[PDB]
């Protein structure tokens, strides 16, 4: 599930609060932001970015 500690957005396993920083590894894409009732804006981190920035 996505959750917020009031400042930052995390994804957690459902049955035990363990906050993981949101990435392309723990999330999957579908479509665009128009179709969903209740979607929120946030960054999603790309683990390949610092590997490509080097």
């Amino acid at each position: 599930v996505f959750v917020s500690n009031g400042t930052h957005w995390f994804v957690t396993q459902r049955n035990f609060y363990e906050p993981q920083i949101i990435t392309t590894d723990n999330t999957f894409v579908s479509g665009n932001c128009d179709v969903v009732i209740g979607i929120v804006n946030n960054t999603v981190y790309d683990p390949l970015q610092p590997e490509l920035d080097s």
Partner: peptide
């Protein structure tokens, strides 16, 4: 059923 099937068809 992958959960995007609900949010994209929620109405």
């Amino acid at each position: 059923v992958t959960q995007n099937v609900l949010y994209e068809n929620q109405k």
